[PDB]
Amino acid sequence: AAQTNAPWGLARISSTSPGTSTYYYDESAGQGSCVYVIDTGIEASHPEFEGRAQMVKTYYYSSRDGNGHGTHCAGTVGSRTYGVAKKTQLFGVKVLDDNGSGQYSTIIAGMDFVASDKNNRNCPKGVVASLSLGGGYSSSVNSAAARLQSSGVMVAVAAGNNNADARNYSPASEPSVCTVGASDRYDRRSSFSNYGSVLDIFGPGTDILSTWIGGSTRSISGTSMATPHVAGLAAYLMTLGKTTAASACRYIADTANKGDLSNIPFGTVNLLAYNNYQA
């Protein structure tokens, strides 16, 4: 299929050259898959989700997205106009407060929650988790993500916006999950994106149009924004039977656009997420 005038990131995913504006994808659109967005929540009433989004867990006085960041990332996973996997099911887990902050004890608790909760849900195509969050190095936080991955969930986590090596941030430094760097519409590494050998893949991360709270939209930047591109894609392909939860990250890196980004330091992969859908 084709989405004319789509956000530059959606077009990037579907293309082998930057600067295009149509996002080509298989009409299956993540149907039968599920993606957990572990963040500040999701505004599930937003028409862009079409009734496919729902909250399933909060750790605060309200399960409402009082910030928009969780709603933004979910829009990149599966909203109709801004999402990669437009027919996927979205489940919100609010581990971050409305200022975007959250304790590690809560995020850990949130990841353990998803590993058990996928057992109440119908996801015959499989399960993905998008974690646009992180902090300084924590072994318990890294182990939390690896458990979620081992439990049968495709975990994609953001590399960090510190313009440094992601080895000193978590869950970014956990080797078994998928650690996403950010790029811009000119195929440069985003000026903020962390780098390093722990990185597995790059996704669109600078000036990303998506949903926002209040029935609205806006453009923001961060590796928080690239993570849901990779999360949607995994779910897309899993529905297509091309890959499974345990192997999606390797598949995406194996089938990415190689050597195409500028300002990738030595030791960091040069791989841009790509759906290789030949229409």
Curated annotation (Swiss-Prot):
Parts forming coiled coils: none
Keyword presence, Disulfide bond: yes
Residues of the whole record sequence present: 106 to 384 of 384
Organism: Parengyodontium album
Keyword Protease: yes
Gene Ontology BP annotations: proteolysis
Domain of life: Eukaryota
Disulfide bonds: C34-C123, C178-C249
Active-site residues, as the UniProt record annotates them: D39, H69, S224
Residues that coordinate or bind Ca(2+) 1: P175, V177, D200
UniProt keyword terms in alphabetical order: Calcium, Disulfide bond, Hydrolase, Metal-binding, Protease, Serine protease, Signal, Zymogen
Family, similarity comment: Belongs to the peptidase S8 family.
EC numbers, comma separated: 3.4.21.64
Main function: Hydrolyzes keratin at aromatic and hydrophobic residues.
Positions with a binding annotation for Ca(2+) 2: T16, D260
Cofactor annotation: Ca(2+)
GO molecular function: metal ion binding; serine-type endopeptidase activity
Name the record gives this protein: Proteinase K
Span of domain Peptidase S8: 7-279
